[PDB]
Nucleic acid binder design. Structure first.
Ligand SMILES: [Zn+2]
Lengths: 60, 125, 206, 98, 24, 80, 153
RNA sequence: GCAUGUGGUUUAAUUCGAAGCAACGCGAAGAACCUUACCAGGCCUUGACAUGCUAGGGAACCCGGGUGAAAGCCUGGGGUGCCCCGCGAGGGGAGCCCUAGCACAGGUGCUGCAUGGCCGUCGUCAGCUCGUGCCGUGAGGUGUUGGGUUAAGUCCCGCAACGAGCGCAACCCCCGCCGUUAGUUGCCAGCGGUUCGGCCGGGCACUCUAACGGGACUGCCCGCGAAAGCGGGAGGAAGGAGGGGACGACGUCUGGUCAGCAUGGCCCUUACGGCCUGGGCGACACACGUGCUACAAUGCCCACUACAAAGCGAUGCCACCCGGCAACGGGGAGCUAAUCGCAAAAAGGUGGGCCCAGUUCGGAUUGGGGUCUGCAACCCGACCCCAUGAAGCCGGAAUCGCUAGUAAUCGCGGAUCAG
C-alpha cells in the first residue's frame, strides 16, 4: 500500500465503478472481506489476538 | 407403536398399527413412493424377521436425506417400534443386527484436497 | 513456521475477547474500524503507563473502555487532569460520549504482555540479551507462575547473523487447551534492526 | 403479546440474559412460553495461514450469531416493571415488537 | 452434453436459463 | 454478435467536435483518444486519428464501415 | 496392508434370490454407484435366461462362475536380475474375484447392443464352457504350465 | 478441443515474486478504466497524505466560463463567521485557505544472507532434552537402552539410575444413542371444522431446533500371556483410540516473503515521487503443470413425476401477472428473515423417441441477430436465439489418487464481486 493510493482510493471518483476496496488496517487491496473490511492477512492477525468479536476458530 | 428411525441425515416417523398389512408413507402406497427402487423391499426385512408380515399397518412419514437411504431409515424405525410391541423380540432381532445405527455420514471436505480424501495430482515430482 | 498464537486458540474455554459486544452486517465493520482507532491513541500515549489490556464493552449509544494499566498513577495524572484529557481526546475521535474506567494491574510480573515489554525496553537500552531473558523468567517464577518463557527474534547484541535465545522454567503446555497461558509480544526497534520479544506464562489449570 | 428476540455472540451470555428475563417475568406476569433456540447463523472465513503464497495452508474462522426467543402473553403494567431496566449482559442485543 | 449450451444439461451446467430450460 | 441495447454510444468529446466540422464542410485531421465510441452514419467521411499505446493512428472512414468502433481500427499489439 | 490381513467386507445377500454371490456380481457391473441400475441389468439378464433356456438362472449363474475360476496363475519375480514368471496355486478368495470380474470385462466386449443382453449371453456361453469368459481363463493357465519350468521358487 | 498457470519467444509495455519433492487454477477470495506496481502521451511540485516554521494576502465555503482526452492551466463571480480589546473605525489571535522560502512528507527503488512477524517443509514422524546420581583423564555415556507391547519415548518386565521438560495422549468442536430444560419447526401422533394446503382450532407428543448432561472403562465371559497387552464372545446405539476436526516438539533447509505490514542499511527526491488519458498484464512458431468437456446405448433427448443438506439476502433475495422463442424487460406482493425468497437439487423413477452412425455421440470455431452490467464491453465481459458443427471412436514411453460411506458419480451453497 502506497499512501498515494490509500488516501487516494478514499476520495469519491467520477465514476462509481472505479471505487475499489482497501484494508482499513494494512492498506492491502487484493483480498479484503467486506464484512470486516480487513486484508486476509489482517483478518487472521486480529482474529488471533481476539480483537474480532464472536470470531472464533471453526471446528467440525 | 412409534419407534424413531434416523439414518444419514434423514428422519423416519414410524407407526405400526395392527392391520391387514399395508404401508402408507407420506400419504402414498409404499410401493408407489418407491418405484423402480431395487432395494426397496429392504424396509420390511425386520418384519419378515419374526414372521409378523401382515398383522400391522404402517403409517410412515419421512423427512430429509435420499430415497436410497430413507429405505434403511424406515427399516430401523420399524425395528425400534417393534420392541414396544414385544421387548422379548430382541432375541431374534439383534442377532440380525437391526437395532444398530451407523455413522456412515459424509466426511468433511478438508482444504488442500478435492474431497475428503482425493488429493490433487502432481506429475514431475 | 509452525505453532499458532496460544490466545487465539483459547478464546472459547479460557480467555475472553479484547472487545466484546454485538453487531449487524451494516455496523460491525464500521464500529470495529473505530474500535481499532481507539487503541491507536492509547498505545501511543499510555506507553510509559504500563498498559495491559483494553476491554471494550459497547451497548446502545453508550461505550466503555476499561484500561488495565500497571501504573494508574500516570494515566490519571494529577488529581484527574490526564484522565480528563484522554476522555476529550477520545471523544474528539468518537462522537459517542464514552466511559473510561481504569483498573490497576495486580502484579506486572504475571502479565506477559507487560513482561515482554519489560524486556523490549531493556534491549533497546543496549542491555545484555541472554541475561535479560533469564532474569525476566525468574521474576515470573518467584511471584507465582506455574511456568514462564521468553524468546528473542534475532540479531542478539547486534550480531550480523540473526539467532534466537530460548529460555523457560516450569510448564508451558502450549498444546493443553485448558492451560491459561498469557502470551505477550514486544518489538524493540534498534539501530541495527527490529527484534521480537515473546513472553509466555503458564498459570493455573481447570 | 410481547415478542422478545435475543441475538448475540456468546451462548452463555444469552442463556443468562434469557434466563434473567424468564425469572422476573413469572413473578409479576403470567404464563411464559419459555426460551427457544432458533437456528443459529454461522459466518465462515477461509483464509490462508501464511501471508506469502501457500494455497494448501488455510485457517478456518467462524462467527455464530445465536438467536433466542421468549414469549410473554397477557402483558401487565407490573410485568413491564421488573422487565423495565433490570438487565446486565453486554454483548447481547434485544429488540421488541408487540 | 455439458458444453452443449443449447440442451437440458447444457444449461443446467451453465446455470443459465433459455429456450431449452425454462421457468415452468 | 455484440450489443449496446437501446442508445448507441459516442463520446461527446468528438461528436460535438466533429459536427462543428460539418458547419464548415470538411477538415483534415482529428485527434482524440476516445476509441470507446461507435461510428455514426452522421460521422462518415472524416479522417480521425486514434491513439494506440504510443502512436496516433489516422483512420479514414468509409460509407461501408459504419457499424464498427474506433478501437477496431487501431491495432495495439505489434506483431511478427 | 502392512500390519494385518485386514478383514474381508461382508455383504448383504440379494433381496430376490438371497445369495451374496449375486450381490457380489452386481457390485461388479455397477459403475458410478448406480447400483439401482446394475440391479436391473442382472435381473433382466436373468429373465433372458428363463425365456432362452429351460433352467433356473440362479443355478446357471453359479455353474458359470464355477467354470471360469482359474486354479493356476502367474506372478512375476526378480531373481537373477530377471523377470521369472512363477506359476502359483491361487487361493479361494482370489478365484471368485477373478471370475466375476472377467465375466464382466468379457461381457461388455460382446457385439450385442443392450447391456443386460451381453450379460445374459456371457452367462450361458460360460456354463457351456466357451465364449471369452472361459477363454480369459484357459489362457492364463495356458501360461501356468507353459512356464512350469519355474515352479521351484 | 477448450480454461487456467508457467517456460520460452514477442512487445513501447506484455509490472513484480514463486522453482525439485516443499513453483506451475501458486500471492491474486474476482485485470475492461479502476485494480496496477508496466509502456506512451499530457500535466503536478511542501506536492495525493503527517507535525511544523519565517514573510506577504485572504473565514472556511459555494456557484459559473474559457482550453482539454482527463488531469491540469487561465478566468470570474457572489462570500465574509469564533476569541480577546477600551464604545467605533479597527487591532492582535485560534481553526481553515493561498503564495514565496524551509524542516519534512512520498518511493511496490535494492537488500528475505542485515531482520520481526507469519508460513512451507522433514513431519502428526516420535522423537528432542534436563536435573541429580553413577561411568569415563576427556570428548562423551547412562537415563531415552534391551526383551514384551502400542497408532505413539503407549504401557509392561528388566537395568545405575530416579525423576522432570518440550512432544503422544487427554481437556475443546462437529458426527452417531439417549436424558433434562425450551415450544409460532413439527403432527388427525388424538379430537372438532376445510376453499382437504397442517389450511383453522387445539394440542407438544413426534420431527426438529439448541444449551446442558449421561454413556465404554478392555469394566464382563473364554483362551494366549510373568505383566503390559492380544484374539474371540456378550450385553449395548457405539468397542477397545467408535468416525472426522482443530491441535505440529528441539531443530533442517542461509527455504519463502522487504509487493501485506513492520524494520537496519544503501539508493531518488522536480524526480526511482504524484494526477490523468489510452494501451498492456489477455500478446503467439512452440513446450510442460492443474483441470474441464467428450469419444456414447450401464448411454443421449424430450415429457410427467420424488427424496437433500448447508449457506446467503435493503435497495438486497424477488413470490406472482403480463410482453417476448428467449436472455431480459414492465408491473408488483412477502421477507428485516426456523414463519418470505434465492429453489430447480441432480443422479433417480414412469413414458416415449434414438438403433450403433462420427451419428439426435461431441460442442470446438465462425457468420448473424439480440439482452444486461456499466461512463465505457474494439483491444478485452458474461448471457440468449438461428446457423455453422471441428478434434475427438478411449489415448506412446511414462505418471497421480484413493483402503468405506472412501474412491467413482451427481447436483446445491458461499466467499470475492456492477458485471
Ligand atoms: Zn489489512
Amino acid at each position: 500500500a502506497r499512501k498515494a493510493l490509500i488516501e487516494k482510493a478514499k476520495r469519491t471518483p467520477k465514476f462509481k465503478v472505479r471505487a475499489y476496496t482497501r484494508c482499513v488496517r494494512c492498506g492491502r487491496a487484493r483480498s479484503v472481506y467486506r464484512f470486516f473490511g480487513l486484508c486476509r492477512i489482517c483478518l487472521r492477525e486480529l482474529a488471533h489476538k481476539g480483537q474480532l468479536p464472536g470470531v472464533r476458530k471453526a471446528s467440525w | 407403536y412409534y419407534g424413531t428411525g434416523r439414518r444419514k441425515e434423514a428422519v423416519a416417523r414410524v407407526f405400526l398399527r395392527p392391520g391387514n398389512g399395508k404401508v402408507t408413507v407420506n400419504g402414498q402406497d409404499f410401493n408407489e413412493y418407491f418405484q423402480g427402487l431395487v432395494r426397496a423391499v429392504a424396509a420390511l426385512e425386520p418384519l419378515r424377521a419374526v414372521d409378523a408380515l401382515g398383522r400391522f399397518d404402517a403409517y410412515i412419514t419421512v423427512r430429509g436425506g435420499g430415497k436410497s437411504g430413507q429405505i434403511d431409515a424406515i427399516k430401523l424405525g420399524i425395528a425400534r417400534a417393534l420392541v414396544q410391541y414385544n421387548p422379548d423380540y430382541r432375541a431374534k432381532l439383534k442377532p440380525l443386527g437391526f437395532l444398530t445405527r451407523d455413522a456412515r455420514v459424509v466426511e468433511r471436505k478438508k482444504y488442500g484436497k478435492h474431497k475428503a480424501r482425493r488429493a490433487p495430482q502432481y506429475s514431475k515430482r | 513456521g509452525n505453532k499458532i498464537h496460544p490466545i487465539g486458540f483459547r478464546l472459547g474455554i479460557t480467555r475472553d475477547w479484547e472487545s466484546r459486544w454485538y453487531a449487524g452486517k451494516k455496523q460491525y465493520r464500521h464500529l470495529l474500524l473505530e474500535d481499532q482507532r481507539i487503541r491507536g491513541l492509547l498505545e501511543k500515549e499510555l506507553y510509559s503507563a504500563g498498559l495491559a489490556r483494553v476491554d471494550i464493552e459497547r451497548a446502545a449509544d453508550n461505550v466503555a473502555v476499561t484500561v488495565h494499566v500497571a501504573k494508574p498513577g500516570v494515566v490519571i495524572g494529577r488529581g484527574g487532569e490526564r484522565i480528563r484529557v484522554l476522555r476529550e481526546e477520545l471523544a474528539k475521535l468518537t462522537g459517542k460520549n464514552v466511559a473510561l474506567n481504569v483498573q490497576e494491574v495486580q502484579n506486572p510480573n504475571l502479565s506477559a504482555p507487560l513482561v515482554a515489554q519489560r524486556v523490549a525496553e531493556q534491549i533497546e537500552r543496549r542491555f545484555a540479551v541472554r541475561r535479560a531473558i533469564k532474569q525476566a523468567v525468574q521474576r515470573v517464577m518467584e511471584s507465582g507462575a506455574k511456568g514462564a518463557k521468553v524468546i528473542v527474534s534475532g540479531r542478539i547484541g547486534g550480531a550480523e547473523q540473526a539467532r534466537t535465545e530460548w529460555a523457560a522454567q516450569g510448564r508451558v503446555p502450549l498444546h493443553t487447551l485448558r492451560a491459561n497461558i498469557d502470551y505477550g509480544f514486544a518489538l524493540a526497534r534498534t539501530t541495527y534492526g527490529v527484534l521480537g520479544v515473546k513472553a509466555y506464562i503458564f498459570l493455573g489449570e481447570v | 403479546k410481547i415478542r422478545i428476540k435475543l441475538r448475540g455472540f456468546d451462548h452463555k451470555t444469552l442463556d443468562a440474559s434469557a434466563q434473567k428475563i424468564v425469572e422476573a417475568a413469572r413473578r409479576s406476569g403470567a404464563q411464559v412460553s419459555g426460551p427457544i433456540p432458533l437456528p443459529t447463523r454461522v459466518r465462515r472465513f477461509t483464509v490462508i495461514r501464511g501471508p506469502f503464497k501457500h494455497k494448501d495452508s488455510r485457517e478456518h474462522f467462524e462467527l455464530r450469531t445465536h438467536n433466542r426467543l421468549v414469549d410473554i402473553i397477557n402483558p401487565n403494567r407490573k410485568t413491564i416493571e421488573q422487565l423495565m431496566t433490570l438487565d446486565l449482559p453486554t454483548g447481547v442485543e434485544i429488540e421488541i415488537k408487540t | 452434453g455439458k458444453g452443449d449450451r443449447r440442451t437440458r444439461r447444457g444449461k443446467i451446467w451453465r446455470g443459465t436459463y433459455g429456450k431449452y430450460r425454462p421457468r415452468k | 454478435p455484440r450489443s449496446l441495447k437501446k442508445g448507441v454510444f459516442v463520446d461527446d468529446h468528438l461528436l460535438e467536435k466533429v459536427l462543428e466540422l460539418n458547419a464548415k464542410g470538411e477538415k483534415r485531421l482529428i485527434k482524440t483518444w476516445s476509441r470507446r465510441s461507435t461510428i455514426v452514419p452522421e460521422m462518415v467521411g472524416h479522417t480521425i486519428a486514434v491513439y494506440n499505446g504510443k502512436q496516433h493512428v489516422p483512420v479514414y472512414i468509409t460509407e461501408n464501415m459504419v457499424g464498427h468502433k474506433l478501437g477496431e481500427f487501431a491495432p495495439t499489439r505489434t506483431y511478427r | 496392508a502392512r500390519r494385518r490381513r485386514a478383514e474381508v467386507r461382508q455383504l448383504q445377500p440379494d433381496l430376490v434370490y438371497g445369495d451374496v454371490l449375486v450381490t457380489a456380481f452386481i457390485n461388479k457391473i455397477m459403475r458410478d454407484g448406480k447400483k439401482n441400475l446394475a440391479a436391473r441389468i442382472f435381473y433382466d439378464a436373468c429373465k433372458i435366461i428363463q425365456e432362452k433356456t429351460g433352467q433356473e438362472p440362479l443355478k446357471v449363474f453359479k455353474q458359470a462362475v464355477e467354470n471360469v475360476k482359474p486354479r493356476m496363475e502367474v506372478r512375476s519375480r526378480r531373481v537373477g536380475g530377471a523377470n521369472y514368471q512363477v506359476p502359483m496355486e491361487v487361493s479361494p478368495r482370489r478365484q471368485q474375484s477373478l471370475a466375476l470380474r472377467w465375466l464382466v470385462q468379457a461381457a461388455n466386449q460382446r457385439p450385442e447392443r443392450r447391456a443386460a443382453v451381453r450379460i445374459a449371453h456371457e452367462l450361458m456361453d460360460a456354463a457351456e464352457g466357451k465364449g471369452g469368459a472361459v477363454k480369459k481363463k484357459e489362457d492364463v493357465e495356458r501360461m501356468a504350465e507353459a512356464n512350469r519350468a519355474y515352479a521351484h521358487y
